[PDB]
Scaffold this active site. Structure first.
Site, short mmCIF file in Angstrom:
data_model
loop_
_atom_site.label_atom_id
_atom_site.label_comp_id
_atom_site.label_asym_id
_atom_site.label_seq_id
_atom_site.Cartn_x
_atom_site.Cartn_y
_atom_site.Cartn_z
N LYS A 58 20.14 21.17 11.01
CA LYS A 58 19.18 21.11 9.92
C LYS A 58 19.70 22.21 9.00
CE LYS A 58 14.51 19.57 11.19
NZ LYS A 58 13.24 19.96 11.89
N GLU A 85 6.97 18.95 7.07
CA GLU A 85 8.35 18.55 7.30
C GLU A 85 8.40 17.04 7.39
OE1 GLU A 85 9.56 20.89 10.60
OE2 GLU A 85 11.62 21.13 9.90
C1 LIG Z 1 9.36 24.16 11.98
C2 LIG Z 1 10.05 23.00 12.67
O1 LIG Z 1 10.79 23.51 13.78
C3 LIG Z 1 11.52 22.66 14.56
O2 LIG Z 1 11.55 21.46 14.33
C4 LIG Z 1 12.30 23.23 15.70
C5 LIG Z 1 12.27 24.62 15.97
N1 LIG Z 1 12.98 25.14 17.01
C6 LIG Z 1 13.73 24.36 17.80
N2 LIG Z 1 14.46 24.93 18.85
N3 LIG Z 1 13.80 23.03 17.57
C7 LIG Z 1 13.11 22.44 16.56
O3 LIG Z 1 13.20 21.08 16.37
#
Ligand SMILES: CCOC(=O)c1cnc(N)nc1O
Ligand SMILES: CCOC(=O)c1cnc(N)nc1O
Ligand SMILES: CCOC(=O)c1cnc(N)nc1O
Ligand SMILES: CCOC(=O)c1cnc(N)nc1O
Ligand SMILES: CCOC(=O)c1cnc(N)nc1O
Ligand SMILES: CCOC(=O)c1cnc(N)nc1O
Ligand SMILES: CCOC(=O)c1cnc(N)nc1O
Ligand SMILES: CCOC(=O)c1cnc(N)nc1O
EC number: 4.1.2.25
Lengths: 121, 121, 121, 121, 121, 121, 121, 121
Positions: free
Chosen positions: G100, G22
């Protein structure tokens, strides 16, 4: 000649469909009609009698879409294209696009459909 | 030559319409204008004097759309197409599409309308 | 040949504009690029080396859009079209459309703009 | 002949991509398919056997989009275009447009992609 | 009491703004008005005289939005909220939201703005 | 209790309106209905007999929207809210929002309307 | 007090994310900020000095969104909420929502995210 | 506490429905999930272990939506709400909204559905 009169996003709830369950439950059909018609005269005269009134055209589409249930979208478009041309001489050509945004197809898509273009003989 | 200058989704509230009640209440008219104009010179010189300014073109559309009430959309488009071409030599061709997304037609549709293409003689 | 690679709805905040205040405050510019490129080889080989990478093309548009302030959208499109063709031989033709959805024009419209098509010599 | 059958906005989540991380995380791929097919017979007969069923076509796109990970969108479109034409004689020509609305490109855009048109030999 | 009369997405082109260039060029202002008004009587009687006519309310918003140029959106909303309440006793409370979807801010956003809620004393 | 059953964006073409010409030409009315109903039982049993079927609710809205022409949107909402509550005991409260996205108001707005909330006594 | 200043649909391209890939590729982050601020004074005085300027607030969000890569959206929102409140006394409370719309999740959804509300102590 | 984690516009193609033909053909189900979870710790620590990962939550929704066919949307929401709360202690409350934008209802509407709110005991 590139003038046109149009009817976009017309929607009707019918029971057409190649599947028995389709015709049983029905769904929304989205229809786009585009007619090739010279609008200079009507553009100069301002007389609705010198053009093709859309309200009437919408009636012809409606009566066909909300009429007896057929199998194919191809048949509905062919019935619409044939019906408009038979009634209006000023329409040099008719184009019908029908969309089933929600058919019996397990997937994610904006819609499926067909489009035909029929000249006025 | 495939260069163009465009004005999309222009909206005006007028009282044009073939029905007496239409002209009484009025409605919103959506207008799309596309001009065929060579933009190489203006593209090279960067001089707005070598092209057709849209702000001015919008004035011509506005004055016609928000002017006296006529009957047909065909007449408004014809008045717009004729007005742009008469004023600008660089416009080799004018295309006007007018849409009545909400006419006096009992149904469900995204809109109805017409579109004309007028070359500059 | 009808194959194409495309970049749609690219948006940049620049200060280009024929009005002094335009260049002072700036605004968002929406850009659409369409390249005429044969993709059979790349379609068969699967080798990004046999096609034109969009990421790179986006760099060329960005550098021009977010670069020095010019006057006309025609100049920006001409600089983009000329820059892509000079760098890529596989691009047989470049088409650039730039839209100012919010120019200094007192009215209601979805946007105004220009579009040019430049063959690769 | 201007008749067509279409599948718009088809979306699949795959791992194709020229970047290692792309194939690792994956993303959504939007696919548009347009087939050139004469629909007069089917329009007259109303027999789905006289046309090309979209549900089946969607299967062919799905199996390819959600299949092994390739590098280029050009390869996926070429595999789709070749697969449809090989299976359907009534399809005189196939056009595939694939869009990556969210690729590994640091910017603001509605999406990037390619489009190919393949005649049925 | 949770009844309301509303006017959504009202748009006006004005020259308000804390920047000199803003007031020079102008922009589109989007306005949302929500009034707290008991509609039981009007719901039972069907008499527009027992409610607050929106057409009139739109006049008050328009006259203020397309009136003299002020500095803050806060001032426009305060002038609108104060004007509606002074004229209509049935309005127990007025809520005004104004949005500048395109201010002099170098970035990508859907819009910025303010929202005030003013009770009718 | 915060459970709800909803019907959003329902659209009907009627002739209601405080203006004579309105009732003459008609327009599209958008309706949003939200019912306060406990869905635990139906959530556990999975029996449509333990909840309020929306299809039926849509019938009640339709019959009222496409019925005799009244003057105020307040009257239509009041007739809908009163009709739903009288027929369903499980509905502890009914909320009706009606929108005239295109009324006889010379301006640019997304729509105007009213919203009422009626408890089931 | 129900007055608010808002910034909606702010978008930034960053490399935050709990997955290594990511942070390697990055993506677009959509941010919504809503501040609780009394606007009566500014509404009466018309003095931007009596309110909280959004342009400045956008700077604080931008600097954080396009700054060092963190892991959680919760951390970005917490850094934004804490930064706004520390700088502005008139902000009685800050609310940050981050979305996102395209995370590393194999599925079809409009987006995922979080939202926090932080009072100004 | 007003913090939340959300999943919006999740879409699945299932065969749930109170009509036999519904379960035979299937349709798209849109799901919105909102969890009440304190995000201060995770906001401070930046540790995904101090919050509820959405990717996992999406798995639970998917497995239920694309699982055995039930009758009511109420049952699916109840199964989702019960499943999330049982697995996550940090979720103080779960809210599930399911929409059938295209049910077996002859009309024009954006969609129908239900919404439940279930606290975590
Ligand atoms: C796979 C990346 O996941 C995240 O960044 C993420 C997942 N769950 C929550 N609650 N926040 C995030 O930032
Ligand atoms: C399952 C129902 O399918 C159809 O109605 C249909 C399929 N394909 C084509 N080309 N037309 C149709 O009407
Ligand atoms: C009822 C009003 O109709 C029209 O104004 C109209 C109808 N048809 C065509 N082709 N043009 C019009 O302007
Ligand atoms: C007022 C600014 O105008 C322009 O920038 C402009 C006007 N017309 C055309 N054709 N191009 C422009 O860039
Ligand atoms: C970084 C990944 O890039 C691609 O996959 C790609 C780039 N350019 C073109 N033309 N096609 C692609 O598939
Ligand atoms: C640059 C112009 O700014 C404004 O008009 C403005 C800024 N902030 C707030 N809160 N209101 C405004 O009107
Ligand atoms: C001109 C027609 O107006 C109305 O129908 C109307 C106006 N105001 C309110 N509050 N309700 C209406 O139905
Ligand atoms: C015809 C199918 O109907 C349903 O599935 C259904 C109807 N009403 C309610 N409240 N829930 C349903 O799932």
């Amino acid at each position: 000649m590139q003038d046109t009169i149009f009817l976009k996003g017309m929607r009707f709830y019918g029971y057409h469909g190649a599947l028995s369950a389709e015709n049983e439950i029905g769904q929304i059909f989205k229809v786009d009609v585009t007619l090739k018609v010279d609008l200079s005269e009507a553009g100069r005269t301002d007389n609705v009698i010198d053009t093709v009134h859309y309200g009437e055209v919408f009636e012809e589409v409606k009566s066909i879409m909300e009429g007896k249930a057929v199998n194919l979208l191809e048949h509905l478009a062919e019935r619409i294209a044939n019906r408009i041309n038979s009634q209006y001489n000023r329409v040099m050509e008719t184009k019908v696009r029908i969309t089933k945004e929600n058919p019996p197809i397990p997937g994610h898509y904006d819609g499926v459909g067909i489009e035909i273009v029929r000249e006025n003989k």
